[PDB]
Write a protein that binds this ligand. Structure first.
Ligand SMILES: [Mg+2]
Ligand SMILES: [Zn+2]
Ligand SMILES: [Zn+2]
Lengths: 134, 1417, 49, 8, 107, 277
DNA sequence: AACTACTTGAGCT
RNA sequence: AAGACCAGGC
DNA sequence: AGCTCAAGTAGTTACGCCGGTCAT
């Protein structure tokens, strides 16, 4: 407990003392052009381009989204988007490398420009640890 | 590095040559004709038009293509192209010189404007300095504007001789935007000098003339300062950033190249078609601009030149500007691989030098260990283990420069290594690594630690290694770096290991002690009252790892067998550790248990705390390091720790409000010490609101009021606390935590249990922000303390709104500078660094730089490494002549003054020997030479100084190594002793040279030591004081010698950076405030700038030899110096109309006329009414006053005056076409250009009684205070030759002056003294050598070269070097301009190059001796 | 602070008027000596008599 | 210092 | 060695370097009232034969320029009447060794 | 529990941050360092509380340091190259005789000190004896006319820029030249630069103001172009919508364009770590 | 924000 | 992907 | 026409290490 570092009673840390939920919301859109060329929200693979990520896309239902139950981690693709140009370059979103948790709420929506708006929220319970500040 | 072997020989840059591109060369080099301004699109088709970027230059898209010189992107440095400009342009940054050149050369012809013929020119022409030549030259030729064809030869100005011709008048040129124009001359004739015109003239300029000006015919000819063909830089320079594929993305420069390109095209297409000759120039100025832009886009003639959007457009030179910009941003410091950083929290179970690393991290950072038949077995295991098991690895690299990824490769667990392959393994326990915490202002802000992989996400460092980095655990983070070569590691462990760092060279004392818990508790455990029983005395011995496995005999056996901390704590102290102390009432049976005495490595007596185990001088640590070594001492921490921390774990310790409450009656006794103190204020306020007090000379009646109120409340507050201090028993926890020395002090207790104190800003108690009041809750003009900010309450009690507020306003000031001095201090630091970098001891013992220029002939004036030095006391110097003799005097020809034969073994057979009494004279006669020589170096008498080889201890070691009795006699010939100490002096070699000048330096830079040496090795002491046997002596001697030789500085020692920091560090720890003469932070600043007008100039002058404590003699000089003007004694002046020069229209004047006609003029009068009280202060006389006046004007102004007796002092006068105008101009000339007494610039002059130690006739030094006059302004040359002063001691803090009057030397002396007094005015201690080195560097080049862009960064140092601080780019420009050559001898150069710099470790070569590589087998 | 608030912006005239009709002899016609210790009045930084 | 005295 | 009381004329002194080999110096009166060398801070200097000099250089391996300098118009430099090219050994007290030996060439 | 008070641009909650500043339309007197041809000076920053809002200040200097014989008083006017000696500023105003000028400055014939000070000044202007020349020396017929202008629309423009009030401004310039001396004679201290009462806080509401104008005014002269082409609808109500958004979104008040010469900070991203946050 | 460098301006023979 | 701005950490 | 002396005006460079939001 020397030099401004304090000792915290594990036992009560377990009984839930100072535990806290942590939320996050990665969000994306489906860009277009006055020149009818739109993007996509799917579960892309192969298909002439390669432009893809390292992680997994399997926790992606066919709507290009995860379900709120899914336990995502490492880098697991949270969203699936594509760009047809001249035939599939990826624009899918990956859970930040340091993070992980569980999906907590997905939602689809319109944009003023009638585009597909989708935000995703992930939850995590954060436990006090031998280093956290108080 | 690079990838793919290159047959071409490998070399390192040993020299850099600067110059300017000759158009013909750029053409030569170019691989692209570059005509088109677009990028590629073969009409939308992606490729790269043969027009811009890659019309053969480098390339994009991962395509080997690049003129078949393949290599694809990585391996292919860029490839330059060019572009033929339509018309000559000015190189944006040279436009200055291009102009100063013309100012020096004639047009229509093109030759110099001053030949050897002109004398002042010869001189300039001989100035050897490519820069100061072209400097002095222009200072001449910028005047003459007649290309003279004939001038008088070196004979008679009668005849004239001819040289070059065509005297066409040369125009006066001026700068207007990007064009040079001038006038030729009634009334001028203006024309705009074209570029084409200028260039032509330059081309013609003669070759020996290029050279006359700052040029070089080979590398940079004056003309090339104008560009013809523009060098176009390639892709890696201005990369493109595409947004996937079907989207643009082009760099900034890849535009102003095209903007230029386009401004070129149109130009030409106007010069080959209907060219409206005066509408082209309107289009030429554009190209001149875009090319100014491209390179520089931050100029005078505003026109920022923004890119479509407002974006400024980074000019090439913008990419370089120091900090962030290439030089200071990418070269002097870059982000590196193999590094990590997280949150620190100390761990009390980690050897001093360890550093717990989170498994996670170790599993991330690797280390390339080549396969070798010693570690193959272990490596093949670590490899199988994979990158996910901790003691594992993550990459294997075969000879075939290719890498296997241990986490994918289908042959992951397969792989059987091959000697010679390298494997990247996870960092493991005991891997040396660089741990640091920035701000990094110490040699110790970075130290190598033993790695200890541990769980949990945090770097776990030892407590005692806390203060070096200066960290705490409130969230602080730490950076870690991982060595990579086998030597890199070694270099990290042999010089940066934490143990080596324990003794800090900046303050020749350790720099890591025992903090908090361990300290606090070690104190308790020591008290006589602290006892421990077997059960625990055992679990305590167990925790000491080195424990011999032997329980020491109980300090008590009688009823219960107990032990005392002092005992067990001692089991941690190694054998041979001898420590002696003595505090206040301390004597070999310390009553209050003070002092400290440890013999044989066992605590004998005294309590242990900050003083005995802190980062202090006598420090048991400081001693264990010196006596046992880095290692032994480094372990010592952990032990003293482990025992104590454990003990405390069980004895417990705390603090609570209860520790801050004062006795029932004491809290009262104080209250009324504030009440009474309140009235001693109300009292002097009454006595002020009555004018019943006199003005203490030099202070305002008001100021003097404060000066007391302040000194009243302060003394009140001072005891207010002191009542409680002694009111807190030896059980008060807070007290305990203060004695241990582990936290807080008196002040603290005070503000918490007694009185908080007086609040303040800008030095004065809470102002009157509200007209005449503190808060609106106050009555106007309330000068009391309850209004001006005096918090009478204690924290335990609680502030009242008012008190609470003021308090805030007070703290607010505090927080301010802790948030200002924070980075300005860092600048001042940075400067010192970039100012001594290249200073390092050399193999001959010279302290020089990247020029060999000798800054110091023997580092520190002795060639000693501060680490090996301690505060010794030169005996000889102090004490009475009487007591001196009775100590070192030996007289074999005397019954009473001879060595009793109970000391020596030949005491009786020696008594009377004439031949011996002579060697005994040589000796005693010596010691006296010393005594008088030391009072010649240290006129203070202070006999304590830092000196290598601690002789006091070295002898104490003999003391018990041979066990000597204070009874039975020694066995040394008198020759044994005396002769033996002479033979020693002979081997204490610092410099080694064969010749004399060197051999002299030897004796020189040694002396001081030798005296200390004699002082403790005089026959008398050596036998009567420390009965040394013959044996002992031969040992002490041999050791002094050995020790010394280790205490010498090592050639390599990067001395400059050291002293640089050593100085700036103890500055980051000061306040920007100059409160509580301009000193501290701002002062140092003031100095390093070599300021021409310091805030406080002031100057101290001492009386003359005799008259010392002559009170009235003081005044008698004051008023002969302190500048007094008529203006300061005149209450009013009026100009009446009195036409009768024999009577007045004024009453109180009559007498004054008649009484002034016994033992022509103007009818206009001028009367002055001087002040009475003002004539007694600066002391003056009507006789004098007027006398002066009269002789000021003289025969054209008759003046009169009354006599000192009257009740109204006056001075009438008249002159001798409008007089009311004249007699008014003479009104001023009287009040502001006329002095009475004093030397100008010298206002206020106070007197003071100072402490001056001095030689009593009877020998001993004693208190003899003497008056001294301090000024408030500065003139020397004059206030020096005044009768009554000692022009051998006078002193102004204005070093600038001192140097001008007493010779640079004396100047240096001041510069140092002033810097020293700035560090020392803060309690902090730094070792001479540091300040000196700085002082010396500023001084050596001849004068006072400031530590600023206008100083060191302006010498003959390398170009790349100075370029890495402040003027970054121009420094290069005027470097390629005059074609400078850089040694690459500067630390910087090499860092910038990526080569090992000549720094300690690299200040030499390592070669295999084939000869000896054969005899070994 | 908790209690602090900022002004917002009222109107001048309903007070300029309210004045030059309760003792405010307008600046326009002033005489420094007949009106010696005349307390001068300012409105939002203007001198209205 | 600031919050104790002038001199301090 | 002329000792001008208040000041010499600009027409005058412009005739000093007009009689070589011999050389001439000018010293103001009010500037010689107190011998400056006498000062506390002023350490002892000393000249050097073109022999004692051509020695220092060999003994330390110096290129002349690498040697600490001293100004021609330096108070002490004038006092001992130096010249551009002459060396000076300075010998002062030192709280570290007792006496240090520095050298300044006169530029 | 959300007390609100914030805007919601493109999603994120933006909070306009109060901008403190030195209030306007007030008299200040400052002493100017020993090294300066000026002794003391009094200033007054003026701007129409409602209508355009000019940012031009009045400088009533006081040359001649606390010694030299020439202690004159000159003042600076908007658009005038050099400075004018107060006397002329008065005659050019509508007061032509001496003592009628001292009438306005000093309010106590028995204060010789102050008056004395003025003396040397009177002498300065003794060369211009009427309203004709008065408005002249301010650089014929062409110049005289402009002289007027800078007095009815530039000179102490608050008070009013009407016409027949010359008198009023004169009493001010008098109250000013007074305030100057009131200090140069140690009777009133130099104005306290940080007396919070004399500083204003431009909250949210105000900000939109100075902002809107900048906008609506580009719409104003925009609607001027459609009307300047019809040799015989148009109002792009997007400059007031998109303009507003830009600012509030980033934190750069002043427009966009090649005008970064604005201030970033105004409008931020409302904290949501804790309620008290 | 403050200085210090560099060059320019106005007073003065 | 680079930059700018605000915020916050010792 | 020309020269010393003071002042003005120009211009430069400054600060250790370490998430959100916006837009070319
Ligand atoms: Mg901290
Ligand atoms: Zn290539
Ligand atoms: Zn010519």
């Amino acid at each position: 407990n020397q030099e401004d570092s304090m000792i915290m009673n594990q036992s009560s840390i377990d009984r839930g003392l100072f535990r806290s939920l942590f939320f996050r919301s990665y969000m994306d859109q489906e860009k277009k052009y006055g020149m009818s060329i739109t993007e996509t929200f799917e579960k892309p693979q192969r298909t002439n381009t390669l432009r893809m990520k390292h992680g997994t896309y399997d926790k992606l239902d066919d709507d290009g989204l995860i379900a709120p139950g899914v336990r995502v981690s490492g880098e697991d693709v949270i969203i699936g988007k594509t760009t047809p140009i001249s035939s599939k370059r990826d624009a899918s979103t990956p859970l930040r490398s340091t993070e992980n948790g569980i999906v907590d709420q997905v939602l689809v929506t319109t944009n003023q420009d009638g585009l597909k708006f989708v935000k995703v929220r992930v939850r995590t319970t954060k436990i006090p640890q031998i280093g956290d500040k108080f | 590095v690079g990838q793919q072997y290159s047959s071409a020989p490998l070399r390192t840059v040993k020299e850099v040559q600067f110059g300017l591109f000759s158009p013909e060369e750029v053409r030569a080099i170019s691989v692209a004709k570059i005509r088109f301004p677009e990028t590629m699109d073969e009409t939308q088709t992606r490729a790269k038009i043969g027009g811009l970027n890659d019309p053969r230059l480098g390339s994009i898209d991962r395509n080997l293509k690049c003129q078949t010189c393949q290599e694809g992107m990585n391996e292919c440095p860029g490839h330059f192209g060019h572009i033929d400009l339509a018309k000559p342009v000015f190189h944006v940054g040279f436009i200055a010189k291009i102009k100063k050149v013309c100012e020096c050369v004639c047009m229509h012809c093109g030759k110099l404007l001053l030949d050897e013929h002109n004398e002042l020119m010869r001189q300039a022409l001989a100035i050897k300095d490519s820069k100061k030549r072209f400097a002095a030259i222009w200072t001449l030729c910028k005047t003459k504007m007649v290309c003279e064809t004939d001038v008088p030869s070196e004979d008679d100005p009668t005849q004239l001789v001819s040289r070059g011709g065509c005297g066409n008048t040369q125009p006066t040129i001026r700068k207007d935007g990007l064009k040079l124009v001038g006038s030729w001359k009634d009334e001028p004739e203006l024309r705009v000098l074209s570029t084409e015109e200028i260039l032509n003239i330059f081309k013609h300029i003669s070759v020996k003339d290029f050279t006359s000006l700052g040029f070089n015919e080979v590398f940079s000819r004056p003309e090339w300062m104008i560009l013809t063909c523009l060098p176009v830089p390639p892709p890696p320079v201005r990369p493109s950033i595409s947004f996937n594929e079907s989207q643009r993305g082009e760099d900034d420069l890849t535009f102003k190249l095209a903007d230029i390109l386009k401004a070129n095209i149109s130009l030409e297409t106007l010069e080959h078609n209907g060219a409206p000759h005066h509408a082209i120039e309107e289009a030429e100025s554009l190209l001149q601009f875009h090319v100014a832009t491209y390179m520089d886009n931050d100029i005078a003639g505003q026109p920022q030149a923004l890119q479509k959007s407002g974006r400024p457009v980074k000019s090439i030179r913008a990419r370089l500007k120091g900090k962030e910009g290439r030089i200071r941003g990418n070269l002097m410091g870059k982000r590196v691989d193999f590094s990590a950083r997280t949150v620190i929290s100390g761990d009390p179970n980690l050897e001093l030098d360890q550093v717990g690393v989170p498994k996670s991290i170790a599993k991330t950072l690797t280390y390339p260990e080549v396969v070798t038949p010693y570690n193959i077995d272990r490596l093949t295991q670590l490899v199988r283990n994979g990158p996910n098991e901790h003691p594992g690895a993550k990459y294997v690299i075969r000879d075939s420069g290719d890498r296997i990824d241990l986490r994918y490769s289908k042959r992951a667990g397969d792989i059987q290594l091959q000697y010679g392959w390298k494997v990247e393994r996870h960092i493991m326990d005991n891997d040396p690594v660089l741990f640091n915490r920035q701000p990094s202002l110490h040699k110790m802000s970075m130290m190598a630690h033993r790695v200890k992989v541990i769980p949990y996400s945090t770097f776990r460092l030892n407590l005692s290694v806390t203060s070096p980095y200066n960290a705490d655990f409130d969230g602080d983070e730490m950076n870690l770096h991982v060595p990579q070569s086998e030597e890199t590691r070694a270099e990290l462990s042999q010089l940066c290991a934490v143990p080596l760092q324990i003794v800090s060279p900046q303050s020749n004392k350790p720099c890591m002690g025992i903090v908090q818990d361990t300290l606090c508790g070690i104190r308790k455990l020591t008290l006589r009252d602290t006892f421990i029983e077997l059960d625990q005395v055992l679990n305590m011995l167990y925790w000491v790892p080195d424990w011999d496995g032997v329980i020491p005999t109980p300090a008590i056996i009688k009823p219960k067998p107990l032990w005392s901390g002092k005992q067990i704590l001692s089991v941690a102290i190694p054998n041979g550790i001898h420590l002696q102390r003595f505090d206040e009432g301390t004597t070999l049976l310390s009553p209050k248990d003070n002092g400290m005495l440890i013999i044989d490595g066992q605590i004998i007596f005294g309590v242990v705390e900050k003083k005995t185990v802190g980062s202090s001088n006598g420090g048991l640590i400081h001693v264990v390091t010196r006596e046992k070594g880095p290692q032994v001492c480094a372990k010592l921490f952990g032990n003293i720790q482990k025992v104590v921390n454990f003990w405390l774990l069980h004895n417990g310790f705390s603090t609570g409000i209860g520790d801050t409450i004062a006795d029932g009656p004491t809290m009262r006794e104080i209250t009324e010490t504030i009440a009474e103190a309140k009235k001693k204020v109300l009292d002097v306020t009454k006595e002020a609101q009555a004018n019943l007090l006199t003005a203490k000379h030099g202070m305002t009646l008001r100021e003097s009021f404060e000066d007391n109120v302040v000194r009243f409340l302060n003394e009140a507050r001072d005891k207010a606390g002191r009542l409680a201090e002694v009111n807190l028993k030896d059980l008060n926890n807070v007290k305990q935590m203060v004695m241990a020395g582990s936290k807080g002090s008196f002040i603290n207790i005070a503000q918490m249990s007694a009185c908080v104190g007086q609040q303040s800003v800008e030095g004065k108690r809470i102002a009157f922000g509200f007209v005449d009041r503190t808060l609106p809750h106050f009555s106007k003009d309330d000068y009391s303390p309850e209004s001006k900010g005096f918090v009478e309450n204690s924290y335990l009690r609680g502030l009242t709104p008012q008190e609470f507020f003021f308090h805030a306003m007070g703290g607010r000031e505090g927080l301010i500078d802790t948030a200002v001095k924070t980075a300005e201090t860092g600048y001042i630091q940075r400067r010192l660094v970039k100012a001594l970098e290249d200073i390092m001891v050399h193999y001959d013992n010279t302290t020089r730089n990247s020029l060999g220029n000798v800054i110091q002939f023997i580092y520190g004036e002795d060639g000693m490494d501060a680490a090996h030095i301690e505060k010794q006391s030169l005996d000889t110097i102090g004490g009475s002549d009487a007591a001196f003799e009775k100590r070192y005097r030996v007289d074999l020809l005397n019954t009473d003054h001879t060595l009793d034969p109970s000391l020596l073994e030949s005491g009786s057979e020696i008594l009377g020997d004439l031949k011996l009494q002579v060697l005994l004279d040589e000796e005693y006669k010596q010691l006296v030479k010393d005594r008088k020589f030391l009072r010649e170096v240290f006129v203070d008498g202070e006999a304590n100084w830092p000196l290598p080889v601690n002789i006091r201890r070295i002898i104490q070691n003999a003391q018990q190594t041979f066990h000597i009795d204070h009874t039975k006699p020694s066995d040394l010939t008198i020759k044994d002793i005396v002769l033996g100490v002479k033979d020693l002096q002979e081997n204490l070699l610092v410099l080694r040279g064969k010749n004399e000048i060197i051999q002299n330096a030897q004796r020189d830079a040694v002396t001081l030591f030798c005296c200390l040496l004699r002082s403790r090795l005089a026959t008398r002491r050596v036998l009567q004081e420390y009965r040394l046997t013959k044996q002992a002596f031969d040992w002490v001697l041999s050791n002094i010698e050995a020790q010394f030789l280790r205490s010498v500085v090592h050639p390599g020692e990067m001395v400059g950076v050291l002293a640089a920091q050593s100085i700036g560090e103890p500055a980051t720890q000061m306040t920007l405030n100059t409160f509580h003469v301009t000193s501290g932070v701002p002062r140092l600043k003031e100095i390093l700038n070599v300021a021409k007008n310091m805030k406080t100039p002031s100057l101290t002058v001492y009386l003359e030899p005799g008259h010392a404590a002559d009170q009235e003699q003081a005044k008698l000089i004051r008023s002969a110096i302190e500048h007094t003007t008529l203006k300061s004694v005149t209450i009013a002046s009026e100009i009446y109309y009195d036409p009768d020069p024999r009577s007045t229209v004024i009453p109180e004047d009559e007498e004054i006329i008649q009484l002034h006609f016994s033992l022509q003029q103007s009818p206009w009068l001028l009367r002055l009414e001087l002040d009475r009280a003002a004539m007694n202060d600066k002391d003056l006389t009507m006789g004098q006053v007027g006398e002066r006046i009269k002789q000021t004007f003289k025969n054209d102004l008759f003046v009169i005056w009354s006599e000192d007796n009257d009740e109204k002092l006056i001075i009438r006068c008249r002159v001798v076409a409008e007089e009311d105008h004249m007699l008014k101009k003479i009104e001023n000339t009287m009040l502001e250009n006329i002095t009475l007494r004093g030397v100008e610039n010298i206002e206020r002059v106070v007197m003071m009684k100072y402490d001056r130690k001095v030689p009593s006739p009877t020998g001993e030094y004693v208190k003899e205070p003497e008056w001294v006059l301090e000024t408030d302004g500065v003139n020397l040359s004059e206030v020096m030759t005044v009768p009554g002063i000692d022009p051998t001691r006078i002193y102004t803090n204005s070093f600038i002056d001192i140097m001008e009057v007493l010779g640079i030397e004396a100047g240096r002396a001041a510069l140092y003294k002033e810097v020293y007094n700035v560090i020392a005015s803060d309690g902090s201690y730094v070792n001479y050598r540091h300040m000196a080195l700085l002082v010396d560097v500023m001084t050596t080049q001849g004068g006072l070269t400031s530590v600023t862009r206008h100083g060191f960064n302006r010498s003959n140092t390398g170009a790349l070097m100075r370029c890495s601080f402040e003027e970054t780019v121009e420094i290069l420009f005027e470097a390629g301009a005059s074609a400078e050559l850089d040694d690459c001898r500067g630390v910087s150069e090499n860092v910038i190059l990526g080569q090992m710099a000549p720094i300690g470790t690299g200040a030499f070569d390592v070669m295999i001796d084939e000869e000896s590589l054969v005899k070994y087998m | 602070s908790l209690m602090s608030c900022i002004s917002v912006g009222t109107d001048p005239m309903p007070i300029i008027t309210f004045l030059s009709e309760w003792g405010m002899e307008p600046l326009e016609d002033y005489v420094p000596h007949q009106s010696p210790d005349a307390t001068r009045v300012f409105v939002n930084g203007v001198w209205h008599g | 210092n600031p919050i104790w005295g002038i001199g301090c | 060695i002329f000792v001008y009381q208040n000041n010499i004329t600009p027409s005058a002194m412009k005739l000093v370097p007009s009689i070589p080999p011999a050389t001439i110096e000018t010293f103001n009166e009010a500037a010689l009232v107190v011998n400056i060398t006498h000062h506390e801070l002023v350490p002892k200097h000393i000249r050097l034969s073109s022999d004692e000099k051509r020695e220092l250089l060999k003994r330390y391996r110096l290129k002349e320029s690498q040697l600490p300098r001293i100004q021609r118009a330096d108070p002490v430099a004038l006092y001992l009447g130096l010249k551009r090219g002459e060396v000076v050994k300075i010998i002062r007290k030192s709280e570290t060794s007792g006496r240090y030996a520095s050298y300044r060439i006169c530029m | 529990f959300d007390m609100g008070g914030y805007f919601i641009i493109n999603g994120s909650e933006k909070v306009l941050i109060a901008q403190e500043r030195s209030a306007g339309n007030i008299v200040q007197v400052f002493k100017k360092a020993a090294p300066s041809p000026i002794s003391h000076v009094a200033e007054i920053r003026s701007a129409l509380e409602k209508g355009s809002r000019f940012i031009s200040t009045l400088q009533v200097k006081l040359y001649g340091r606390e010694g030299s014989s020439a202690r004159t008083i000159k003042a600076t006017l908007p658009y005038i190259k050099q400075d004018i000696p107060i006397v002329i500023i008065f005659r050019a105003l509508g007061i032509i005789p001496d003592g009628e000028i001292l009438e306005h400055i000093c309010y106590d014939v028995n204060d010789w000190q102050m008056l004395e000070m003025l003396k040397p000044c009177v002498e300065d202007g003794f060369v211009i004896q009427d309203r004709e020349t008065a408005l002249d020396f301010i650089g014929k017929e062409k110049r005289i006319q402009y002289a007027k202008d800078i007095l009815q629309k530039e000179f102490l423009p608050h008070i009013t820029q009407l016409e027949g009030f010359e008198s009023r401004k004169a009493f001010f310039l008098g109250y000013m030249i007074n305030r100057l001396l009131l200090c140069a004679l140690d009777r009133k201290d130099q104005d306290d630069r940080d007396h919070f009462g004399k500083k204003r806080l431009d909250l949210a509401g105000p900000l939109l103001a100075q902002l809107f104008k900048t906008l609506f005014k580009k719409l104003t002269k925009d609607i001027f172009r459609y009307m300047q082409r019809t040799v015989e609808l148009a109002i792009n109500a997007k400059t007031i919508t998109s303009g507003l958004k830009y600012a509030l979104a980033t934190g750069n008040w002043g427009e966009q364009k090649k005008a970064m010469s604005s201030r970033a900070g105004v409008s931020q991203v409302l904290n949501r770590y804790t309620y008290s946050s």
